[PDB]
Amino acid sequence: VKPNYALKFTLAGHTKAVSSVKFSPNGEWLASSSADKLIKIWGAYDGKFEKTISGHKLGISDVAWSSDSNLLVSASDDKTLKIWDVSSGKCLKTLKGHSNYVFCCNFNPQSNLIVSGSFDESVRIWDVKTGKCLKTLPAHSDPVSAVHFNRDGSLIVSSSYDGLCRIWDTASGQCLKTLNPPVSFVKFSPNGKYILAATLDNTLKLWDYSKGKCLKTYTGHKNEKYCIFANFSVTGGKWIVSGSEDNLVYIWNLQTKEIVQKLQGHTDVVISTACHPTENIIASAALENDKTIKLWKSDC
Ligand SMILES: OCc1c[nH]c(CCCc2ccccc2)n1
Ligand SMILES: [Cl-]
């Protein structure tokens, strides 16, 4: 069985490169971040523009939702993160402490913590309520490309241009495991047993966290320059989804590693993809020659 993702909506509005798209956990919204210093909120199902959220002084590299879909966090070149009330569009907290661009961010499942990764080579853990930095992890020896909490928030996985993926005990900040090309993206599988890692040699790899071994390798896409998001699609067939520097969305069969679909339409690097939490829907977003978000729907 292969998916049949077809274009449903093109979301225009950003005036520079889109950096990240994420579906709200309740499935209602897509959030987009951009080099244009803005967050935009869109209807997940009708693609309808809802609102612009502004306040960062420089471009945004990443955005992430709280578990209840009420808050966003953004990571910016202004060296801050901002926590946003999505309903009001208001900045609740500015998280200050990184000494260079903040590149990546995520809430834990409880959504009492935010993890961030920075060009300053550190991973920070922040208290959402106070906006204060709880821990600074001397995580890497080059810019941090991705940070992600596992299913219960007990672990953080980080990746870096230093070629390392590290797994951190959230509660203590201690490194549990180091899992040489630059690692441009990492995240835990929904069940937290696997880590998906991108390297800037046109390769995605599925790792068994507990055993520390590579189970699957996905190739055929172009990825030598940008930190391109990748996803587990789990609503229908079990796919791996990624953007690509050849302007396509790549979908692989997770088990067989065969490319099952390439989605055409973007006119620049597909930097970010997201999979809808309940429906067979993909969001894709592209760099500055395109600047659009596309919503795609499949029957499986
Ligand atoms: O965790 C992987 C990750 C986070 N953010 C990105 C996108 C980087 C590209 C980009 C940056 C700033 C403006 C426009 C585009 N990848
Ligand atoms: Cl996620």
Give, for ligand 1, the residue of 62, 81, 196, 269 to mutate: max count of ligand atoms closer than 8 Å to Cβ.
62
Q: Across the beta sheet with 281-286, what order do the strands follow? A: 6-11, 293-297, 281-286, 270-275
Partners of residue 116 on adjacent β-strands:
105, 124
Closest-approaching ligand to the CA atom of 161:
1
Nearest CA to ligand 1 atom 7: 19
- For residue 286, give the 3-state DSSP assignment: strand
| Resolution stated for this PDB structure, in Å | 1.7
Nearest CA to ligand 1 atom 3: 227
Listed residue (267, 218, 49, 234) closest to 284, CA to CA: 267
Give, for ligand 1, the residue of 32, 227, 231, 268 to mutate: max count of ligand atoms closer than 8 Å to Cβ.
227
The DSSP H or E segment spanning 102 is strand 102-107
Measured CA to CA, the distance from residue 119 to residue 285 in angstroms comes to 23
Domain residue extents for the chain: 1-300
Measured CA to CA, the distance from residue 77 to residue 59 in angstroms comes to 6
Measured CA to CA, the distance from residue 205 to residue 225 in angstroms comes to 17
Residue 214 CA to ligand 2 center (angstroms) comes to 21
**Contact by Cβ (8 Å): 144, 158:** yes
Q: Which two tokens stand for residue 262?
A: 């390439």
Listed residue (70, 69, 73, 42) closest to 55, CA to CA: 73
Q: Which two tokens stand for residue 231?
A: 């996803």
CATH of domain 1-300: 2.130.10.10
